[PDB]
Design an enzyme around this catalytic site. Structure first.
Site, PDB file in Angstrom:
ATOM      1  N   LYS C 129       1.133  -1.422  -0.041  1.00 30.73           N
ATOM      2  CA  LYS C 129      -0.087   0.055  -0.145  1.00 30.73           C
ATOM      3  C   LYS C 129       0.786   1.473   0.390  1.00 30.73           C
ATOM      4  O   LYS C 129       2.725   1.475   0.505  1.00 30.73           O
ATOM      5  CB  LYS C 129      -0.692  -0.193   1.430  1.00 30.73           C
ATOM      6  CG  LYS C 129      -0.593  -0.024   2.243  1.00 30.73           C
ATOM      7  CD  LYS C 129       0.336   1.433   2.959  1.00 30.73           C
ATOM      8  CE  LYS C 129       1.969   1.593   2.906  1.00 30.73           C
ATOM      9  NZ  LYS C 129       2.329   3.457   3.312  1.00 30.73           N
ATOM     10  N   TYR C 217      -3.141   4.692   7.182  1.00 30.06           N
ATOM     11  CA  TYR C 217      -3.581   3.825   8.645  1.00 30.06           C
ATOM     12  C   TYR C 217      -4.689   4.596   9.243  1.00 30.06           C
ATOM     13  O   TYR C 217      -5.688   3.524   9.685  1.00 30.06           O
ATOM     14  CB  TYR C 217      -2.179   3.243   9.591  1.00 30.06           C
ATOM     15  CG  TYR C 217      -1.209   3.083   8.937  1.00 30.06           C
ATOM     16  CD1 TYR C 217      -1.151   1.579   9.259  1.00 30.06           C
ATOM     17  CD2 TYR C 217      -0.045   3.567   8.185  1.00 30.06           C
ATOM     18  CE1 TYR C 217      -0.257   0.898   8.306  1.00 30.06           C
ATOM     19  CE2 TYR C 217       0.877   3.170   7.245  1.00 30.06           C
ATOM     20  CZ  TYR C 217       0.835   1.509   7.307  1.00 30.06           C
ATOM     21  OH  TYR C 217       1.574   1.130   6.622  1.00 30.06           O
TER      22      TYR C 217
HETATM   23  N1  NDP Z   1       2.998  -2.119   4.681  1.00 32.54           N
HETATM   24  C1  NDP Z   1       4.112  -1.252   6.006  1.00 32.54           C
HETATM   25  O1  NDP Z   1       3.990  -1.300   7.090  1.00 32.54           O
HETATM   26  C2  NDP Z   1       5.171  -0.132   4.867  1.00 32.54           C
HETATM   27  C3  NDP Z   1       5.257  -0.240   3.070  1.00 32.54           C
HETATM   28  N2  NDP Z   1       5.735   0.489   2.451  1.00 32.54           N
HETATM   29  C4  NDP Z   1       5.918   0.722   0.907  1.00 32.54           C
HETATM   30  O2  NDP Z   1       6.726  -0.387  -0.062  1.00 32.54           O
HETATM   31  C5  NDP Z   1       6.556   0.236  -1.157  1.00 32.54           C
HETATM   32  C6  NDP Z   1       8.819   0.745  -1.100  1.00 32.54           C
HETATM   33  O3  NDP Z   1       8.972   1.190   0.262  1.00 32.54           O
HETATM   34  P1  NDP Z   1      10.467   1.206   1.027  1.00 32.54           P
HETATM   35  O4  NDP Z   1      11.417  -0.179   0.518  1.00 32.54           O
HETATM   36  O5  NDP Z   1      10.562   2.034   2.374  1.00 32.54           O
HETATM   37  O6  NDP Z   1      10.796   1.992  -0.576  1.00 32.54           O
HETATM   38  P2  NDP Z   1      12.766   1.347  -0.455  1.00 32.54           P
HETATM   39  O7  NDP Z   1      12.847   2.910  -2.080  1.00 32.54           O
HETATM   40  O8  NDP Z   1      13.437   1.795   0.665  1.00 32.54           O
HETATM   41  O9  NDP Z   1      12.682   0.726  -1.915  1.00 32.54           O
HETATM   42  C7  NDP Z   1      12.025   0.564  -3.116  1.00 32.54           C
HETATM   43  C8  NDP Z   1      12.800  -0.298  -4.044  1.00 32.54           C
HETATM   44  O10 NDP Z   1      11.546  -0.214  -5.289  1.00 32.54           O
HETATM   45  C9  NDP Z   1      13.032  -0.615  -6.233  1.00 32.54           C
HETATM   46  N3  NDP Z   1      13.316   0.264  -6.789  1.00 32.54           N
HETATM   47  C10 NDP Z   1      12.584   0.533  -9.088  1.00 32.54           C
HETATM   48  N4  NDP Z   1      12.822   1.051  -9.222  1.00 32.54           N
HETATM   49  C11 NDP Z   1      13.120   2.187  -7.876  1.00 32.54           C
HETATM   50  C12 NDP Z   1      12.321   3.992  -8.571  1.00 32.54           C
HETATM   51  N5  NDP Z   1      12.813   4.346  -8.845  1.00 32.54           N
HETATM   52  N6  NDP Z   1      13.375   5.171  -6.930  1.00 32.54           N
HETATM   53  C13 NDP Z   1      13.041   3.739  -6.180  1.00 32.54           C
HETATM   54  N7  NDP Z   1      13.144   2.430  -6.014  1.00 32.54           N
HETATM   55  C14 NDP Z   1      12.976   1.384  -6.937  1.00 32.54           C
HETATM   56  C15 NDP Z   1      14.018  -0.865  -5.070  1.00 32.54           C
HETATM   57  O11 NDP Z   1      15.392  -2.211  -6.014  1.00 32.54           O
HETATM   58  P3  NDP Z   1      16.335  -3.023  -6.208  1.00 32.54           P
HETATM   59  O12 NDP Z   1      16.888  -1.624  -5.320  1.00 32.54           O
HETATM   60  O13 NDP Z   1      16.033  -3.945  -5.436  1.00 32.54           O
HETATM   61  O14 NDP Z   1      15.962  -2.241  -7.549  1.00 32.54           O
HETATM   62  C16 NDP Z   1      14.436  -0.045  -4.379  1.00 32.54           C
HETATM   63  O15 NDP Z   1      14.980  -0.354  -3.428  1.00 32.54           O
HETATM   64  C17 NDP Z   1       6.176   1.930  -0.840  1.00 32.54           C
HETATM   65  O16 NDP Z   1       4.673   1.724  -1.753  1.00 32.54           O
HETATM   66  C18 NDP Z   1       5.546   2.442   0.310  1.00 32.54           C
HETATM   67  O17 NDP Z   1       4.134   3.046   0.711  1.00 32.54           O
HETATM   68  C19 NDP Z   1       7.365   0.762   3.123  1.00 32.54           C
HETATM   69  C20 NDP Z   1       7.081   0.827   4.089  1.00 32.54           C
HETATM   70  C21 NDP Z   1       5.842   0.070   4.963  1.00 32.54           C
END
Ligand code: NDP
Ligand code: NDP
Ligand code: NDP
Ligand code: NDP
Ligand code: GLC
Ligand code: GLC
Lengths: 381, 381, 381, 381
Positions: C129, C217
């Site tokens: 989400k 939330y």
């Molecule tokens: N349910 C909950 O508790 C939570 C949900 N979320 C959701 O999870 C998702 C990701 O959040 P989060 O993990 O914090 O974010 P991060 O930016 O830490 O991770 C996103 C991952 O997406 C990949 N990626 C691919 N293209 C892009 C781009 N252009 N820009 C950035 N990342 C890209 C990368 O993976 P790689 O390097 O492996 O290619 C990156 O590490 C969001 O939708 C957020 O709302 C986040 C935290 C809590």
């Protein structure tokens, strides 16, 4: 769609109204008259101010050995300066029929003395805890009460504190299941410079250390929480030999007791560690934690089980029951008025002193002391 | 008025990114292989699952007397069916270099045997507490360890528990002032229908009752909180004679201790009341309440002073330190790899067994037992 | 007088025993294989580690744009280096039957794309989400799901959280009486130096500010607590104009809602203040306080009435239900295996995106936006 | 080794002693005389009993439209039955020089009226909140105060409650960091049968619904907690159209405000949900939770950060400051005696009424109301 009758009928003009709803204990009268003996820390900080909340008590007169103070105090509470006695003419109160009772708030060793002189004065007695510095002196106080055909009440405020009563109530309801282990702790740092603490360091005046002073709350509490008496007792005490505060009386002492039901308990009192007032009652269904357990204010209790903690404390806007101080004072007033036995009679206060003696004995000998002497809590805990 | 370079630089199309911020311990390696002995309650509920959070450890083999159970557990944790041993061919692990250590989670009386066989098999040892059922057996384990030039660690999970270490830290930093009174309580209802509790009812297999099983936490905890050893102990135990659970081991037992610093302590353990895990450390400046004190989860501590209760528990989003199960497991691993002593050595496990021995002796004779034998905590508490 | 049959039957020598009592969810199978997309903060800190506690799920493959990072993560979780995909050859997963679903943990604007490609690859989808950054995109995902005859689940971890479900249960059981006022707050300090927060600062990648990120939330929670949908919303947002963090997305935003039942709610989310996760549900018989309300850990709820605070949190020794991360993962798994609908379908994720849209519209125009569009929660809240 | 001087020097014989240590606010005098107008729920439950604790105030006379009640009340507090006025001869108090001030505890619509008639009587005024039912009537009260050259004080008890002051104190110390989001809630179930509630249901007498009655605590609180005034305001209100209790006045209403510093806030009041008094102040360093926030008793505050909750509340044995009721009464007495501006002047009470009007306006129009009218808190919050 339309306002109910009462709303619309209220006049938009200045108009008297009926008596409001009571969300707090209201004053009712001051028929019972008290004579306070011993104007110390407790008397002036807790007992005197605690009268304002009473529903049937007043401060008729004072008794002090410090004319000046007793003067100032009289003014503050508007006590007739002519009703100011001393420890030598104290008996002259027998003249005044407006002095129904006496509240003895003097050092432990002086309790009995003034209780007996009080009863011979034909007045009722409210004596502070601990009752006296000897079982024999407790018996005498009781004997002097029956002779004057008056009532003897010990200042066990916790027997009049809402949360403590709530704690007893929930336990009787079997909310904790079968009772098996009680833990208690009562402490506060002793300040030798505190005027009220000086006599407490003398075995002759105090009668003992922390146990006589505050550990009695653990002892007394363990008893009404479990609702029964100990049959056996074991104990140990220790104090820093280089601490001038504990030359005559004990600092820390620990006691273990067993009960007829089979329940056990361990507790302690301390004069060298900060504020602690914590009681724990363990059952096979739940566990009760009282902390603060015996505070003048802010007591808090909790019933815990895996994943739960049901807390109870005084409400924030309403007040379902009067405070322990006021409730204690009015209790005697009640007892007399309605001709009924007080909940905290001289016998109860003697049970604790008798138990405390057994405990000091156990710690001196390092052996258990049999305390199965058929005492019975008349009126229940 | 403009976004930072970090923001504007993020591509808007699918793109690789750097390693993220860690708000929790990340897995690193699986260099240290363990052989778990005894697939019972603690193993399957806490230890096996505890491996996932490890940063240097892995499950390499299993040793059980139930081939059926072992087959099922091995499949659940990716263990090679070929590395399932029984108690007879146990010694064969000596032939596998992938097995670096063993983790004994067998009942108490079986500990020493397997610890020794493990050492003869050239492996390090993680043995659950209580170490053994005799002081002598503890020493034999320490001897086998030294003869094999391997490490011996006792499963004191609280020595790697974030909240317990925090309590030890604020005490060492004099947040409670001088320490004078410690209270502990450890209880849980013993269920004879639980396969795990059956051997605990047998003196021969358990080595004792609630003290050996859970009382040990109040004892060990009192020691690491005060940061010193007891020089003397007193005790008393009692168990309902008609209860089938306590024919051979004790249900309730209470103990008192005095330390060189002058501090005192009083605690108990119970096999007949509900879940209690509460540690209290009274200082002359503050009082520390740990409750839960030694839980698998949700520990909470509080430093109280008149008018305040400063609480500390694990955060809601971040995880500053690893959990006690995983940390304990990685602790032995890191010790071997870094050529460093363990924090919970066989000597520590022996000090407890020795003290419990004194405590049982004291309750048996009704006299204080001197424990001033000079144990010295290598590496601090 | 004699031990039970269970006790006396335990052999005193090494012997096999039965499967122990479970005081915590035991691993069962690893039938459902997942392909994780985006090895970022949520994935590495929460989801990947969350797999260990699963009872029916496993990590089968990885999809990242950082081959270096993927190689390191694959080794940490036993993933076959051959099953590491990038964003270009992603569609090739369609050729692997061991991949049952994908879990999209990419920034918001990239969600729809991969969800759709995953469905075209014949896989089920777990998408984080907020679902997507446009209502239309949410519908497209729902369409792709239905065309592929696969399931679409949105990562609403709180819908599988033990304490949140407990709060929903006591409300449904009328413990708070009639519901009239709900308050929510969700905040955390945004750090532009955190790689994870960089895309959140970009409107194009995030879809909005604190509302989209964490305000969701309070919104979702208000909906599942009340057990009904808002029919109208009002809102206002504000962000310091000189703060580089809020050039494109909002920092603070507040919203009010009215429900068909008549209940009201008011909440906010913040990117500039410290950790807050607090839900309040006022009923006419009681008030419920969830605080922390939506933590990864240590959630705590309390039902308050004058004089009482009944608290509930996870137990200290037992674990009655699995954690939200593992449960969420197993929920999709079980749904596929049991041929049953998910509890957090694409439709649920869309209702939120749609509402957030209304909320942003309302704050933009300063007028209430009608949301009485008839969404119906399939399967209860 | 030996008792200090003071201990050994205490006589084992009855002997007067110096004044004890003060652990509680001691009485000092009753120089300032009060005339209580309006003997309703608040007056008899909270204000009248609150005099016993005062250090410089007394109840000189009463004013009522119910002769009988005013009689009984006189007796209970020993007020001279000749000093019992009515709403028609109220002005005759100007004769008595012992009546220094008047405490107006009447319906909101009658406040001003009796304040002005009071000032013309040359007496000082203590008026309950809310000040009046119109900004114009507040100004008149202020004008009448300057003419008679007397002091005007509004009954904002929370400005005299220890915990509330502790809350302001810690916030000024920057313990929460930069302030960004305040949340408030104040509620209680309205009982139309309650005599005191009937006038509250009339717009003519009350001046409005829950906001005028209790939501003002949130408004006022948000102001002194943040220590500044709102420049903008937005609001919405709703009440069940079939509830006869809200035909004229509002049940629930929600308001959002912005402050010069940039801080935001959302709060609400309710007449249809149980007791709620909860304030939340979010900073970028920590978060403050006051709950109970404005209770007559048992307030509790907590400063939270990830992993910590530092709670503060009234001590259990000592009392560092007088209760809000007594403290409020003596404050005016002080102000006069030492010739100094009161902390809660008529201007302050007018600011809230002026802000409340702006809020009702915002909810009526659904548009924001600019409240940036240069008000200045003379003397600080
Ligand atoms: N349910 C909950 O508790 C939570 C949900 N979320 C959701 O999870 C998702 C990701 O959040 P989060 O993990 O914090 O974010 P991060 O930016 O830490 O991770 C996103 C991952 O997406 C990949 N990626 C691919 N293209 C892009 C781009 N252009 N820009 C950035 N990342 C890209 C990368 O993976 P790689 O390097 O492996 O290619 C990156 O590490 C969001 O939708 C957020 O709302 C986040 C935290 C809590
Ligand atoms: N229920 C409870 O909560 C508490 C009960 N108590 C009990 O109240 C009693 C008094 O305690 P506390 O007020 O703390 O003590 P203080 O020393 O403050 O008061 C003792 C008072 O006793 C009078 N007095 C007469 N002669 C003696 C003498 N020989 N030496 C000392 N005082 C003497 C004095 O009255 P004056 O100077 O007026 O002549 C003195 O002020 C004790 O029995 C104590 O256990 C105390 C605290 C709590
Ligand atoms: N650190 C802590 O928190 C805890 C430590 N412990 C300690 O762990 C150890 C085991 O306790 P727990 O797991 O509860 O006990 P269980 O009886 O559930 O497990 C013991 C395992 O030992 C094996 N076994 C071999 N011979 C015997 C025998 N004759 N009788 C019984 N078991 C035997 C069995 O494994 P199999 O069937 O695989 O052959 C059995 O499952 C004890 O020393 C206990 O003190 C326990 C709980 C908590
Ligand atoms: N600071 C705080 O905590 C609180 C402040 N207050 C404020 O105190 C004031 C009174 O509240 P409360 O005591 O609850 O109300 P009640 O209805 O209990 O008291 C109102 C009193 O006003 C007098 N009165 C005169 N004429 C009128 C009239 N036209 N209709 C109604 N009463 C009239 C009556 O006195 P009599 O019958 O003696 O002639 C009546 O008893 C309000 O302004 C309220 O906001 C109230 C509660 C809390
Ligand atoms: O210190 C007091 C101690 O005395 C001895 C008892 O055996 C022990 O149970 C008790 O705790
Ligand atoms: O219900 C009150 C609401 O009024 C409107 C505002 O935009 C919103 O922020 C506030 O919460």
């Amino acid at each position: 769609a339309t306002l109910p009758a009462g709303a619309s009928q209220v006049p938009t003009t200045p108009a008297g109204r009926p008596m409001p709803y009571a969300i707090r204990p209201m004053p009712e009268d001051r028929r019972f008259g008290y004579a306070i003996v011993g104007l110390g820390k407790y008397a002036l900080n807790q007992i005197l101010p605690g009268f304002a909340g009473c529903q049937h008590s007043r401060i008729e007169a004072l008794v002090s050995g410090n004319a000046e103070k007793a003067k100032i105090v009289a003014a503050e509470y508007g006590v007739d300066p002519r009703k100011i006695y001393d420890y030598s003419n104290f008996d002259k109160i027998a003249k005044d029929p407006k002095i129904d009772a006496v509240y003895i708030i003097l050092p432990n060793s002086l309790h009995a003395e003034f209780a007996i002189r009080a009863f011979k004065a034909g007045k009722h007695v409210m004596c502070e805890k601990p009752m006296a510095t000897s079982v024999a002196d407790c018996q005498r106080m009781i004997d002097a009460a029956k002779a004057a055909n008056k009532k003897l009440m010990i200042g066990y405020r916790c027997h009049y504190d809402p949360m403590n009563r709530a704690a007893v109530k929930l336990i009787r309801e079997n909310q904790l299941g079968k009772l098996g282990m009680v833990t208690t702790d009562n402490s506060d740092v002793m300040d030798q410079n505190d005027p009220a603490q000086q006599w407490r360091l003398r075995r002759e005046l105090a009668g003992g250390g922390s146990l006589m002073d505050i550990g009695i709350y653990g002892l007394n509490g363990t008893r009404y929480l479990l609702g029964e008496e100990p049959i056996e007792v074991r104990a140990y005490t220790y104090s820093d030999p280089n601490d001038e505060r504990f030359v005559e009386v004990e600092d820390r002492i620990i006691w273990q007791m067993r009960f007829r039901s089979g329940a056990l308990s361990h507790g302690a009192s301390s004069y060298s560690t900060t504020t602690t007032s914590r009681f724990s009652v363990q059952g096979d269904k739940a566990v009760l934690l009282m902390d603060p357990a015996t505070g003048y204010y802010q007591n808090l209790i909790s019933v815990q089980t895996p994943g739960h903690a049901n807390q109870s404390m005084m409400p924030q806007f309403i007040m379902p029951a009067n405070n322990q101080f006021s409730a204690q004072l009015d209790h005697l007033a009640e007892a007399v008025i309605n001709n009924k036995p007080v909940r905290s009679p001289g016998e109860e206060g003697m049970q604790d002193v008798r138990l405390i003696q057994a405990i000091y004995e156990a710690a001196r000998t390092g052996r258990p002391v049999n305390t199965d002497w058929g005492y019975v809590r008349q009126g229940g805990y």
